[PDB]
């Protein structure tokens, strides 16, 4: 009816980092969820620090 | 419930 966008998005917001840090606090993050492709980037701890 | 405070980064 209105065609008035309810998303007033800002250029100095980071929605992706807001969502990556959200899933750490609301749920377990080491677990893998293939539907949202929720598989966290993780280096091997024996390769980074020898 | 509705009394639980909202999740924010660092507070």
């Amino acid at each position: 009816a209105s065609q008035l966008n309810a998303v007033v998005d800002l250029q100095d917001r980071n929605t992706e980092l807001s969502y990556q840090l959200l899933l750490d606090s609301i749920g377990d993050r080491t677990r893998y969820f293939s539907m949202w492709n929720q598989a966290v980037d993780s280096y091997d701890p024996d390769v980074r620090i020898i | 419930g509705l009394r639980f405070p909202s999740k924010m980064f660092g507070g």
């Binding site: 250029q11 990556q20 980037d41 | 924010m8 507070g11």
Partner: protein, 200 residues
């Protein structure tokens, strides 16, 4: 350049509806259209995110915020990125972004945290924050030292005692009644003590 390509065939929007009773879903509809029952959310990051460029082999990075209201200010959180590993997201296409690795700006996979020496915060050109002789070096946030002669380091590394106190209080409320391992729900994945690994 390496021949990768993505092409969209057909895209559909899906929407799962709770099969609520039509007198219940009309009562909830009528309650949620009041001005007092407006749904209000917040961004989890909740931050204005500013990228300041650092030249090659540059040590001092001076920035400035000109003169603003500072009411309801929550704090700072800073991490050095790479210009190669960060796209220009203001445009719809970045032709100069020749990199397809992990993006720490978006993935949260920050790794250049150790490349900070110290931070000074001065409000209004004279009011050094936090001031008040709070820290062991109260006019700056010494994150690490290259030469320690007065013995102000923790954890058998070069992280200072000011900055370990600040970071164990920013994340964990730990530090005025002894340092200890925070409980595993406070100590999340993107937190401090989960990832702080000192070496020698």
């Amino acid at each position: 350049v390496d021949g990768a390509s993505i092409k969209f065939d057909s895209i559909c929007l899906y929407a799962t509806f709770f099969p609520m009773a039509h007198n219940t879903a009309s009562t909830l509809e009528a309650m949620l259209r009041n001005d007092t029952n407006d749904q209000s959310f917040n961004d989890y990051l909740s931050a204005a995110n500013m990228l300041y460029p650092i030249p090659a082999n540059a040590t001092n990075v001076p920035i400035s915020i000109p003169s603003r209201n500072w009411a309801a200010f929550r704090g700072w959180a800073f991490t050095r990125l790479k210009t190669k590993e960060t796209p220009s997201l203001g445009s719809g296409y970045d032709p100069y972004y020749t990199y397809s690795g992990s993006i720490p700006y978006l993935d949260g996979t920050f790794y250049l945290n150790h490349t900070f020496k110290k931070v000074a915060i001065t409000f209004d050109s004279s009011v050094s924050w936090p001031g008040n002789d709070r820290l062991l070096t109260p006019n700056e946030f010494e994150i690490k030292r290259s030469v320690d002669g007065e013995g102000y380091n923790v954890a058998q590394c070069n992280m200072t005692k000011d900055w370990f106190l600040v970071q164990m209080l920013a994340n964990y409320n730990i530090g005025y009644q002894g340092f200890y391992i925070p409980e595993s729900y406070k100590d999340r994945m993107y937190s401090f003590f989960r990832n702080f690994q000192p070496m020698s």
